[PDB]
């Protein structure tokens, strides 16, 4: 919501500052007034105001303990509930106006850190920051060792945020984290992995706990890297653009411990590729206990990539096999029908998948005829009151 | 046995599973479209094309 809106429009700024004395001081007057007034704004603006409100409190997590947040808020409500419910202390009562300045003061009283830079970055420069953190590859048996460059410039609505850090996963190793700077024409290193060699023998030297995975399938002559990340806990308002080997994206989709990483590799592999191995790893991702909505956007991945399968119809008419191999009512002799609820993974998944199946088109007349008749058959085979769950939205998305 | 002894006739197994639920669901579709046609020509009607 936030990135889309402040690239549609200008910033969503959190003033302390007036234009007092008939002054404007409003670059964010890309449409309208904001400074002293509620009733100028748009619901797009007011909504994104609340959204930036969420995420700037996440930045205050990112500089300050949650326990300290409990401390701050308890001090707030202690002073307020103390200042309430009395005989009206005359001249001594407005402590329930607990606005920005003294609140900030109370924060720094709990822990005085450099959060006024946090303010003047995010509270007082309403800018979203893209990132051209450009992947380079040192220790590609390189003398220079595990290096990647930092880059950014994109005006219209830009902002330059420097000193932060970087989160990288090795093959089976350290979450490497690396500092950042301003003056952003930068080149930086990685706190290097070991010589991950003889990796047929180094099968799993402890990827992340007792996770179990083996592929030499990537460009694994000299690839001791697995995944790039900047701030997986989503600190900076970001829109990160970079490039890896596609193997690394797909293998991240084999597993990663972030839904963030999973759906962003979902988007990155929604752009370009079509190997059938992509389809394979997609379907593999769809059939486990991983996540619900991951699988919904994975369905839409299959939609795009099988739409790229016009001359490259290598795989089947896709995803019929997914209703085959994942759905046994009474072993389901060729058609899945009945009572497929109480397991709400499957609820969302059946709710979603035939839409992406109805997307599957290859250019002769885009011809989803099998899918057409199949979906009509899905609409046939709906349940009685054996499902206790009002077979409603399932109808709705089959209709969609 | 063709004259003396006798037997018993049950004569209706009809237990073809997928065919059974095909029968039931097809019949449900029938009753759908039937009541649709009924209140279609019954009540206030507006169309998709002109005069359907």
List keywords for this structure.
part of a larger assembly; 2 chains; A: mainly alpha; 3-stranded antiparallel sheet; two-stranded parallel ribbon; 13 helices; 7 strands; globular; B: about 50 residues; mainly alpha; about 50% helix; Transcription initiation factor TFIID subunit 8 (chain B); Transcription initiation factor TFIID subunit 2 (chain A); transcription; DNA; Nuclear
Given helix and strand content, the structural type of chain A is mainly alpha
Total strands of chain A: 7
* General form of chain B: rod-shaped
**Rg of chain B to the nearest angstrom?**
23 Å
Give the SSE order of chain B as H and E letters.
H
Largest interface: A-B, 9 and 7 residues
The termini of chain A sit apart by 24 Å
Q: What percentage of the residues of chain B does DSSP assign to strands (E)?
A: under 5%
Strand content of chain A: 5-15%
**Strand order, sheet with most strands of chain A:** 4-3-6
- Characterize the overall form of chain A: globular
Describe the biggest sheet of chain A? 3 strands, antiparallel
**Sheet having the most strands of chain B:** none
The number of helices of chain B is: 1
Helix content of chain A: 25-40%
Order of helices and strands of chain A: HHHHHEEEEEEEHHHHHHHH
* Count of runs of 4 or more consecutive helical residues of chain A: 13
- What would you call the quaternary organization? part of a larger assembly
Radius of gyration of chain A: 27 Å
Protein name (chain B): Transcription initiation factor TFIID subunit 8
Family (chain B): Belongs to the TAF8 family.
Organism (chain B): Homo sapiens
Subcellular location (chain B): Nucleus; Cytoplasm
């Amino acid at each position: 919501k936030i990135v889309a809106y402040e690239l549609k429009t200008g910033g969503v700024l959190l003033h302390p500052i007036f234009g007092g004395g008939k002054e404007k001081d409003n670059p964010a007057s890309h449409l309208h007034f904001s400074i002293k007034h509620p009733h100028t704004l748009s619901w797009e603006y007011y909504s994104m105001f609340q959204c930036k409100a969420h995420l700037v409190m996440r930045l205050i997590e990112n500089r300050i303990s949650m326990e300290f947040m409990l401390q701050v808020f308890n001090k707030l409500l202690s002073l307020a509930s103390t200042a309430s419910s009395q005989k009206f202390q005359s001249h001594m009562w407005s402590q329930m106006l607990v606005s920005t300045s003294g609140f900030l003061k109370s924060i720094s009283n709990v822990s005085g850190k450099d959060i006024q830079p946090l303010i003047k970055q995010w509270v007082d420069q309403s800018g979203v920051v893209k990132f051209y953190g450009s992947f380079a590859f040192n220790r590609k048996r390189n003398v220079l060792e595990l290096e990647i460059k930092q880059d950014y410039t994109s005006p219209g609505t830009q902002k330059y945020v420097g000193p932060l850090k970087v989160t990288v996963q090795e093959l089976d190793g350290s979450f490497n984290h690396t500092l950042q700077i301003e003056e952003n024409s930068l080149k930086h290193d990685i706190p290097c992995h070991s010589k991950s060699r003889r990796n047929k023998k180094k099968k799993i030297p402890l990827m992340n706990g007792e996770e179990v995975d083996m592929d030499l399938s990537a460009m694994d002559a000299d690839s001791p890297l697995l995944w790039i990340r900047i701030d997986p806990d989503m600190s900076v308002l970001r829109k990160v653009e970079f490039e890896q080997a596609d193997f690394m994206w797909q293998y991240q989709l084999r597993y990663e411990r972030d839904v963030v990483a999973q759906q962003e590799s979902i988007l990155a592999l929604e752009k370009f590729p079509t190997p059938a191995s992509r389809l394979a790893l997609t379907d593999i991702l769809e059939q486990e206990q991983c996540f619900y909505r991951v699988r919904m956007s994975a369905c839409f991945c299959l939609a795009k990539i099988a739409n790229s399968m016009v001359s490259t119809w290598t795989g089947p008419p896709a995803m019929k096999s997914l209703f085959t191999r994942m759905f046994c009512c009474k072993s389901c002799p060729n058609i899945v029908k009945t009572n497929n609820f109480m397991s709400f993974q499957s609820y969302f998944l059946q709710k979603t998948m035939p839409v992406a199946m109805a997307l599957l088109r290859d250019v002769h007349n885009l011809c989803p005829k099998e899918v057409l008749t199949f979906i009509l058959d899905l609409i046939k085979y709906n349940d009685n009151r054996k499902n206790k769950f009002s077979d409603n939205y399932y109808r709705a998305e089959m209709i969609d | 046995x063709x004259x003396x002894x006798x037997x018993x006739x049950x004569x209706x197994x009809x237990x073809x599973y997928q065919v059974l639920r095909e029968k039931a669901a097809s019949q449900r579709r029938d009753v759908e479209r039937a009541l649709t046609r009924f209140m279609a020509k019954t009540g206030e009607t507006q169309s998709l094309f002109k005069d359907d």
